[PDB]
Design an enzyme around this catalytic site. Sequence first.
Site, PDB file in Angstrom:
ATOM      1  N   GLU A   1      69.780  46.160  86.297  1.00 12.64           N
ATOM      2  CA  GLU A   1      69.011  44.927  86.604  1.00 12.64           C
ATOM      3  C   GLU A   1      69.575  43.712  85.865  1.00 12.64           C
ATOM      4  O   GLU A   1      69.752  42.687  86.514  1.00 12.64           O
ATOM      5  CB  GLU A   1      67.548  45.111  86.233  1.00 12.64           C
ATOM      6  CG  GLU A   1      66.845  46.090  87.149  1.00 12.64           C
ATOM      7  CD  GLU A   1      66.564  45.569  88.548  1.00 12.64           C
ATOM      8  OE1 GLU A   1      66.905  44.399  88.820  1.00 12.64           O
ATOM      9  OE2 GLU A   1      66.001  46.332  89.360  1.00 12.64           O
TER      10      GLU A   1
ATOM     11  N   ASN B   1      66.402  35.491  94.117  1.00 17.07           N
ATOM     12  CA  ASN B   1      66.140  36.414  95.244  1.00 17.07           C
ATOM     13  C   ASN B   1      66.277  35.663  96.573  1.00 17.07           C
ATOM     14  O   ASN B   1      66.403  34.408  96.580  1.00 17.07           O
ATOM     15  CB  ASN B   1      64.747  37.029  95.138  1.00 17.07           C
ATOM     16  CG  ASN B   1      64.555  37.818  93.864  1.00 17.07           C
ATOM     17  OD1 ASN B   1      65.327  38.728  93.579  1.00 17.07           O
ATOM     18  ND2 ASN B   1      63.530  37.475  93.100  1.00 17.07           N
TER      19      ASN B   1
ATOM     20  N   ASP C   1      64.123  35.048  99.044  1.00 18.63           N
ATOM     21  CA  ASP C   1      62.918  34.398  99.638  1.00 18.63           C
ATOM     22  C   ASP C   1      62.478  33.152  98.854  1.00 18.63           C
ATOM     23  O   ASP C   1      61.340  32.698  99.088  1.00 18.63           O
ATOM     24  CB  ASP C   1      61.751  35.386  99.653  1.00 18.63           C
ATOM     25  CG  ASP C   1      61.490  35.992  98.287  1.00 18.63           C
ATOM     26  OD1 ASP C   1      62.277  35.704  97.360  1.00 18.63           O
ATOM     27  OD2 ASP C   1      60.519  36.748  98.164  1.00 18.63           O
TER      28      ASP C   1
ATOM     29  N   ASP D   1      64.308  36.395  89.762  1.00 12.63           N
ATOM     30  CA  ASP D   1      64.131  37.554  88.866  1.00 12.63           C
ATOM     31  C   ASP D   1      64.534  37.136  87.460  1.00 12.63           C
ATOM     32  O   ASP D   1      65.628  36.560  87.300  1.00 12.63           O
ATOM     33  CB  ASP D   1      64.943  38.746  89.365  1.00 12.63           C
ATOM     34  CG  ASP D   1      64.468  39.316  90.693  1.00 12.63           C
ATOM     35  OD1 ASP D   1      63.310  39.096  91.061  1.00 12.63           O
ATOM     36  OD2 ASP D   1      65.268  39.994  91.328  1.00 12.63           O
TER      37      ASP D   1
ATOM     38  N   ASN E   1      59.932  39.559  89.008  1.00  8.98           N
ATOM     39  CA  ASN E   1      60.035  38.676  90.198  1.00  8.98           C
ATOM     40  C   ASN E   1      58.910  37.635  90.176  1.00  8.98           C
ATOM     41  O   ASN E   1      57.744  38.012  89.984  1.00  8.98           O
ATOM     42  CB  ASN E   1      60.054  39.497  91.498  1.00  8.98           C
ATOM     43  CG  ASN E   1      60.376  38.666  92.721  1.00  8.98           C
ATOM     44  OD1 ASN E   1      59.629  37.767  93.089  1.00  8.98           O
ATOM     45  ND2 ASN E   1      61.492  38.961  93.366  1.00  8.98           N
TER      46      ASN E   1
ATOM     47  N   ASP F   1      50.880  49.674  89.186  1.00  4.76           N
ATOM     48  CA  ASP F   1      50.162  49.101  90.355  1.00  4.76           C
ATOM     49  C   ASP F   1      50.109  50.111  91.509  1.00  4.76           C
ATOM     50  O   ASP F   1      49.277  49.881  92.404  1.00  4.76           O
ATOM     51  CB  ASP F   1      50.736  47.744  90.777  1.00  4.76           C
ATOM     52  CG  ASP F   1      52.021  47.804  91.584  1.00  4.76           C
ATOM     53  OD1 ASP F   1      52.563  48.936  91.797  1.00  4.76           O
ATOM     54  OD2 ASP F   1      52.477  46.722  92.000  1.00  4.76           O
TER      55      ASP F   1
END
Length: 129
Positions: A35, A46, A48, A52, A59, A101
Amino acid sequence: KVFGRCELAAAMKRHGLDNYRGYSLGNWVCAAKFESNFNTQATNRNTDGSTDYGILQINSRWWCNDGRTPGSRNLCNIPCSALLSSDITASVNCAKKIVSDGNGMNAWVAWRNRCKGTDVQAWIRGCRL
Ligand code: NA
């Protein structure tokens, strides 16, 4: 701050990631390597309009506020810059809410693509832990 493999392994263990949600330390080190290259300052735009941030490339779409991420959520309730500190507390604590999550470490694309189903114990081999 750029960590070595075993230096980050020990820092992550110190912050209670070793077997957090049943994910052994090797999984976290492996994710961090692919990462951020163990660099707390790593930033990557990223697809969209999100970015990050930090050692686990958290994100802005979902997890923090960077003031440019479309109609955005701040689920870890921090500015994204908090994740770039040489102190990894913020990145570790946010990562705990990410992995909890329900999707586990699949949230990390690098984990899913490069660590999942591999010998992740290699990642803490020769490390004082
Ligand atoms: Na955000």
